[PDB]
Design a binder for this molecule. Structure first.
Ligand SMILES: *Sc1ccc([N+](=O)[O-])c(C(=O)O)c1
Length: 197
């Protein structure tokens, strides 16, 4: 089968690397869903379909969701919780199971929607992987390590290219990291002591 990947938030900066790594995989079809598609970086891979839509437009999202195998969400901004709920519902409506969901801020009250998004994903019964990246750099490197749900981050930063590489490895082999909620950091970027607030 063709492997149908839906990229929600496809104009995002991590998304752009994923799209690029997906561009020469001739057995993937990638659907690129974005609010403002005319600001999706060019040229447009031949295995792509570019759809204008907002994840809170439930009708648009269901249309895009039909027939998909793997959802990759790189969602930002207000109401991330409402957004996650909308993604879960559309996956369930369209019989799609596999979700890769990035939670990156881009402690405190603005984390509540993020926590509520994460909790909703963990309670969804979907085949999920939640990805939790350290501070994002634009360094041209792939250098990372992973921490589990209840472990502290072993580092301070991680390249977007690193996070894209993980996403792509999961898309390539989607049986990996099912049911996990993983921190991603560059090795040897642990913070100086002591700590301050
Ligand atoms: S992907 C999807 C969403 C909704 C519906 N629906 O019938 O309301 C369908 C479908 O046509 O089976 C598919």
């Amino acid at each position: 089968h063709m492997k149908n990947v839906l990229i929600l938030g496809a104009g995002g900066q991590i998304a752009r690397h994923v799209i690029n790594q997906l561009a020469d995989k001739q057995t993937i079809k990638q659907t690129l869903f974005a609010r403002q598609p005319a600001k999706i970086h060019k040229p447009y891979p031949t295995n792509s379909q570019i759809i204008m839509g907002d994840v809170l437009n439930h009708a648009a999202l269901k249309q895009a969701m039909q027939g998909q195998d793997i959802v990759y969400a790189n969602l930002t901004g207000e109401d991330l919780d409402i957004q996650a709920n909308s993604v879960i519902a559309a996956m369930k409506a369209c019989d799609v199971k596999r979700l890769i969901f990035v939670l990156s801020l881009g402690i405190g009250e603005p984390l509540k929607p993020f926590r509520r998004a994460a909790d909703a994903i963990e309670a969804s019964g979907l085949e999920y992987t939640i990805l939790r990246p350290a501070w994002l750099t634009d360094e041209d490197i792939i250098d990372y390590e992973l921490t589990s749900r209840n472990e502290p981050f072993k580092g301070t930063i991680v390249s977007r290219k690193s996070v894209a590489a993980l996403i792509t490895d999961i898309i390539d082999k989607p049986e990996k990291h099912i049911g996990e909620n993983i921190g991603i950091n560059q090795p040897g970027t642990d913070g100086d002591k002591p700590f301050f607030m």
